[PDB]
Amino acid sequence: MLILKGTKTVDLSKDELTEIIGQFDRVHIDLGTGDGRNIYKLAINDQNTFYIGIDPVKENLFDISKKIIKKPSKGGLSNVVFVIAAAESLPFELKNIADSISILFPWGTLLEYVIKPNRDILSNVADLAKKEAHFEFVTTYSDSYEEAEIKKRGLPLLSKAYFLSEQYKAELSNSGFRIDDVKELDNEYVKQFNSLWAKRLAFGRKRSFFRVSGHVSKH
């Protein structure tokens, strides 16, 4: 398993990970975490949870990664690690570790995995979580082109009706996710997030966002 220490990637063993999370009552995993700013804000405000942000593009994380390793007086944190990995190839070391898991504003292939949904991929995501872990997926089209691309490929259109459908619910269930709630949210809700991408979404044109949440049932 590869983690980020500043701008450098280093190996982290299962045994090392175990020792780190031993100091926390809860563990949260944010998949496709982006620039790290969402995780940073959560972590600084909740020192009783260990936050794992996973992203395949390490350069997206450099700035926040450099911040978390500073002294506490300069913004350093001890309850955050950034894992460099993709949804299609998650580290075995993260199996059965999370009390909660989020996928926030995914785009491209990750978004397709969530909305189709891709059973094989979501099953591997569910494997990261402990029995009955909380989950939330928050989705929207990134831009008109992405909307057109997903639609051209014959993928389902993002709507509350679709996420409420018996078919989506059954498919997520087969992947190990029990949907408890589906909400349509607005730009104002998104303003709560701290990532640059979320700010751009929140303050840009009016857009529909959807939150599907519940608990991991696979276990």
- Is residue 196 part of an annotated ligand binding site? yes
Contacts of 163 (CB under 8 A, 6+ apart): 179, 182, 210, 212
**Is 203 within 8 Å of 41 (Cβ atoms)?**
no
Determination approach = X-ray
- The DSSP 8-state label assigned to residue 157 in this structure reads P
Lookup result for tokens 């570790």: 97
Q: How far apart are CA 106 and CA 95, in angstroms?
A: 21
- Is residue 157 part of an annotated ligand binding site? no
Q: Which tokens in the block code for residue 52?
A: 């794992």
- Is residue 104 part of an annotated ligand binding site? yes
**Amino acid type, 179:** I
Provide the resolution (angstroms): 1.8
CATH number of 1-219: 3.40.50.150
Contacts of 184 (CB under 8 A, 6+ apart): 160, 208, 209, 210
- Is residue 120 part of an annotated ligand binding site? no
- Is residue 137 part of an annotated ligand binding site? no
- Is residue 161 part of an annotated ligand binding site? no
Task: Give the Cβ contact number of residue 5 at 10 Å.
Answer: 14
Q: How far apart are CA 219 and CA 199, in angstroms?
A: 36
**Is 207 within 8 Å of 187 (Cβ atoms)?**
yes
Q: Is 87 left (phi over 0), alpha (psi -120 to 50) or beta?
A: alpha
- Is residue 197 part of an annotated ligand binding site? yes
- Is residue 107 part of an annotated ligand binding site? yes
Contacts of 26 (CB under 8 A, 6+ apart): 48, 49, 50, 99, 100
What are the sequence ranges of the domains in the chain? 1-219
Furthest C-alpha separation in the chain = 51
- The DSSP 8-state label assigned to residue 83 in this structure reads E
